[PDB]
Design brief:
The structure is cut from a larger assembly and holds one chain. 39% of the residues lie in helices and 0% in strands. The protein contains five helices and no strands. The protein binds one RNA strand of 106 nucleotides through residues 104-105, 117-120. It is classed as ribosome.
Length: 129
Amino acid sequence: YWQARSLLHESNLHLDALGENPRYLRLRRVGSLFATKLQNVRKLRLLLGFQRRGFVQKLYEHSLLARGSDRMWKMVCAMEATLPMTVTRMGLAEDVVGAATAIRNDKIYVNGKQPVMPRKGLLEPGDVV
RNA sequence: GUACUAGGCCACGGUGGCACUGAAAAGGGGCCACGGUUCUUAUGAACCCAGCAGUGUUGAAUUUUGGACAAUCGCUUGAACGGCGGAUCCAGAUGCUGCUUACAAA
């Protein structure tokens, strides 16, 4: 009941009403700003620490061209098929950036010796790491 | 609705006219006239990069006077992995891109 909210219900964790019984007037309502989209792209790149445009753009078109069920459990599946997120799922680093340095050493051993594609992934199902 | 990719077909080879041969006609085949470029002791001859590189003007801007027949593919030759091809294949300079890139050591 409390948990498992809607996957796009992130407007309940930004500003709320009828749960704050004080300050009846002067309540901040959200304006028409696209800066939350730009900072959400910042939340996307900060989960990779990578240069802003090219990687998230290339993963965006790959996420469109892979399958067409939806864009929410599958676009983050395109995020999750990437190798630095995959290493963070294994737990070989404190965070994504340290894992990126570890793969920058080529300490990693994806599919035998090394990933053939270091910056882009993409780990298909059936690929050892 | 509008600049390219590669490739289909046509047209043209400084300009214009025409012919041989060939089954079919001419981009480094033949003849004449033009317009250029050089030289003559001036009488006349030689040549025509919209082939490759390269030069010069203009341009905001335009590449190396590279290697090679080995791969094709073509032409040719009955030896000979033969001969040739600025087609091509490989390298350069140069926009776009996809893709890596810390060294040490087995």
